[PDB]
Amino acid sequence: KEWQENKSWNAHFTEHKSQGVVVLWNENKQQGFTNNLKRANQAFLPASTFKIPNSLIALDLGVVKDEHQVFKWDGQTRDIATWNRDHNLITAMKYSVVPVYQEFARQIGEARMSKMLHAFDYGNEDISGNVDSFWLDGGIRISATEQISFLRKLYHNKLHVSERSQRIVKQAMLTEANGDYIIRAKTGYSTRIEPKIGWWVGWVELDDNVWFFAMNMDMPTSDGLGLRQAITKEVLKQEKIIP
Amino acid sequence: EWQENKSWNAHFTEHKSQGVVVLWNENKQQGFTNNLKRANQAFLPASTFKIPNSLIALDLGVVKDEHQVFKWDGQTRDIATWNRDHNLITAMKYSVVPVYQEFARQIGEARMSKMLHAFDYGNEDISGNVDSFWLDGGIRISATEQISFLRKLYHNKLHVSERSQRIVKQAMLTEANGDYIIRAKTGYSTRIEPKIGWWVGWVELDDNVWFFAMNMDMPTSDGLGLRQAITKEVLKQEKIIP
Ligand SMILES: *C(=O)[C@@H]([C@@H]1N=C(C(=O)O)[C@@H](S[C@@H]2CN[C@H](C(=O)N(C)C)C2)[C@@H]1C)[C@@H](C)O
Ligand SMILES: *C(=O)[C@@H]([C@@H]1N=C(C(=O)O)[C@@H](S[C@@H]2CN[C@H](C(=O)N(C)C)C2)[C@@H]1C)[C@@H](C)O
Ligand SMILES: [Cl-]
């Protein structure tokens, strides 16, 4: 079977009074696994997971020259302390620094942004709303399975931007690495529009396979943000993908 | 299990449109689509919701049978065929919204919600009152979820009576000749972008059934005949119909 539903994962959500979906894709076997086929295909605002396409576009157009170029803090004090400082592409993705990315989006502009998202086959391809906030409160919507589709293209250097742009963004996605696995991923937290959700999308590299993943979960308060990674890792552990 | 056939894209291109056709071969348990991503994107069902609405109305006795007359309220609407009395068959044929809104009000939010959950029909998070949610964007469903729903209806597997299912399948009858029968329902969603047309149903042959669900961009009503015409071009290419 190409898609298997595994309701046993639901226990990882219920143990925290949570609801959500984990989608896994076994690249070598070309098979998918999820606790909820319907929610796997439900499309939501990408929030900070949009930094993946945003970064690729910015690099390919030369808005970002490389991963060292520094984006000076604009001096406005924001509620997230790590945003109140200078950043490069690596640290901007690590601390999800929206204001840096909003500047990239303004410099890309609506025509190039729209064209590029069409070329990437990204979600519903709709950038309606403010050019610099549409991924937080505009028309764009992507599901977990569509996040996987997009990430598999990035993994294989098959998106319609240069190989270099793809390699730099994969470098910026680096989240965790040890002797057992590498995780390249990006978190999101959508709060402007209901329903409020957390995301974690990315992949696990093993010695001889890659497992892509995309999860989202209801997120009524920020109390639960750690569960985005913790529930995903419980699933990976259950499936014997990681120790 | 699923096969992407981009050659069908040419049937949309001939017409300067974009869309998706999903087919399912019941005997072989295999699916075909020109567009896997669009096949799984959820769109407002519009008039295709009359299929579940009918099943629920019959099953709860809101509709006694397919002969019961629902009188016109005397208010002239934009669609001429709505300005007259209807029964279930004609209300389905002419997609008579005001008749189906009254069914929904009599079903009521609680029963509608529970029954659509039981059918596994549409998004988990439905919003909007019972007479409007299915017009205004409070529910959405993909082409592949339409197929799964219609497969259960075909086999009398939904959690309503066999009688309710047989009556709705009768009301869905669209075309029959010596080569095939088509049971289906059209949709035209205009209140939220992208405006789309649907056609969902199945083709009965002597020894197999092919389920189908298509939707396609519909920026004006001029293209509405393409819902059936494009589907049938795909059926004809696939040797399902002569
Ligand atoms: C992206 O979806 C949104 C951002 N993502 C966040 C999140 O995951 O909480 C925050 S920023 C993040 C909070 N902790 C990090 C930090 O500073 N340290 C770990 C030291 C940064 C934000 C809501 C974005 C659209 O706002
Ligand atoms: C359903 O999606 C919506 C209805 N569907 C329509 C359609 O397919 O055009 C119209 S009613 C339809 C128009 N032509 C038929 C007719 O009167 N004759 C064939 C003579 C009836 C409508 C937008 C519904 C949600 O409104
Ligand atoms: Cl790296």
Distance from the B24 Cα atom to the nearest Cα atom in chain A, whole angstroms: 16
Tokens 């069914």, residue? B103
To 10 degrees, the CA torsion angle through A30, A31, A36, A38? 50
C-alpha A34/C-alpha A39 separation (Å) is: 9
The tokens describing A45, both together, are 């605002």
Residue among B167, B166, B233 at smallest CA distance from B199:
B233
Q: Which of B95, B189, B214 has most ligand 2 atoms within 8 Å of its beta carbon, as the pocket-test mutant? A: B95
Residue among B28, B6, B2, B1 at smallest CA distance from B234:
B6
Instruction: Give Cα B26 to chain centroid, integer Å.
Output: 18
**Interface residues of chain B, partner chain A, Cβ below 8 Å:** 1-2, 37, 40-42, 120, 123-125, 142, 145
Phi first, then psi, for residue A52 (nearest 5°) are -65, -60
B124-133: string of b/e by CB count within 10 Å (b at 16+)?
A: eebeeebbeb
B124–A41 CB contact, under 8 Å: no
Query: Residue B155: CB partners within 8 Å, gap ≥ 6?
Result: none
Distance from the A68 Cα atom to the nearest Cα atom in chain B, whole angstroms: 36
The tokens describing B242, both together, are 């002569």
The tokens describing A178, both together, are 């040890």
State whether the beta carbon of B79 lies less than 6 angstroms from ligand 2: yes
Q: Which of A79, A132, A189, A223 has most ligand 1 atoms within 8 Å of its beta carbon, as the pocket-test mutant? A: A189
Contact yes or no for B135/B191 (Cβ under 8 A) = yes
Query: Residue B61: CB partners within 8 Å, gap ≥ 6?
Result: none
- Residues annotated within the binding site of A are 48, 51, 96, 228
Identify residue B161 by its one-letter amino acid code. S
Residue with the smallest CA separation from ligand 1 atom 17 is A82
Residue with the smallest CA separation from ligand 2 atom 16 is B94
Concatenate the DSSP letters of all residues of B191-206 into one string: SSSSPEEEEEEEEE-S
Q: Which of A55, A80, A101 has most ligand 1 atoms within 8 Å of its beta carbon, as the pocket-test mutant? A: A80
First-to-final CA distance of chain B: 26
State the pairing for strand pair A174-177/A142-143: unpaired
State the pairing for strand pair B196-204/B181-189: antiparallel
Tell me the helix, strand and coil percentages in chain A, rounded to 5.
40, 20, 40
Neighbours of A19 (CB within 10 A): 16
Largest CA distance in chain B: 51
> Domain limits of chain A?
2-243
Cis peptide bond prior to B98, omega within 30° of 0: no
Contact yes or no for A230/A13 (Cβ under 8 A) = no
Best interface-test mutation with A: which of B38, B41, B141 has the largest number of A CBs within 10 A?
Answer: B41
C-alpha A133/C-alpha A45 separation (Å) is: 11
Domain A2-243 has CATH 3.40.710.10: yes
Q: Which residues in chain B are contacts of A41 at CB distance < 8 A? A: 40-42, 142
Q: Which residue of B has its CA nearest to A121?
A: B37
Q: Which residues in chain B are contacts of A124 at CB distance < 8 A? A: 41
B120–A38 CB contact, under 8 Å: yes
Contact yes or no for A31/A1 (Cβ under 8 A) = yes
Residue among A13, A126, A109 at smallest CA distance from B41:
A126
Tokens 């991963």, residue? A67
Residue among A192, A95, A96 at smallest CA distance from A136:
A192
Nearest-Å Rg of the Cα atoms of chain A is: 17
The tokens describing A142, both together, are 């992507």
C-alpha A227/C-alpha A216 separation (Å) is: 10
Long-range contacts of B229-238 (CB under 8 A, 24+ apart): B230/B11, B230/B12, B230/B15, B230/B17, B230/B19, B230/B21, B231/B21, B231/B199, B233/B11, B234/B8, B234/B11, B234/B21, B234/B23, B235/B203, B235/B210, B237/B7, B237/B8, B237/B11, B238/B23, B238/B32
Q: How far is CA A43 from CA A21, A146, A215, B68, B82, in A?
A: 12, 8, 12, 40, 35
Neighbours of B188 (CB within 10 A): 17
Q: Is A68 helix (H, G, I), strand (E, B) or coil?
A: coil
Q: Which residues surround ligand 3, an ion (CB under 5 A)?
A: A 171, 174
Phi first, then psi, for residue B200 (nearest 5°) are -130, 145
C-alpha B93/C-alpha A85 separation (Å) is: 64
Point out which residues pair with B185 in neighbouring strands: B200
C-alpha B32/C-alpha B41 separation (Å) is: 16
Q: Examine the residue annotation and report whether A48 is marked as an active-site residue of this protein.
A: yes
Nearest-Å Rg of the Cα atoms of chain B is: 17
For domain B1-242, the CATH architecture is: 3-Layer(aba) Sandwich (3.40)
Pick the ligand that lies closest to the CA of residue A170: 3
Contact yes or no for B130/B107 (Cβ under 8 A) = yes
Residue among B75, B100, B76 at smallest CA distance from B86:
B100
Q: Which residues in chain A are contacts of B142 at CB distance < 8 A? A: 41
Concatenate the DSSP letters of all residues of A90-121 into one string: HHHHHTT-HHHHHHHHHHH-HHHHHHHHHHTT
State whether the beta carbon of A47 lies less than 6 angstroms from ligand 1: yes
The tokens describing B80, both together, are 């001429």
C-alpha A136/C-alpha B45 separation (Å) is: 26
Tokens 């943000």, residue? A225
State the pairing for strand pair B19-25/B2-4: unpaired
Q: Which residues in chain B are contacts of A3 at CB distance < 8 A? A: 1
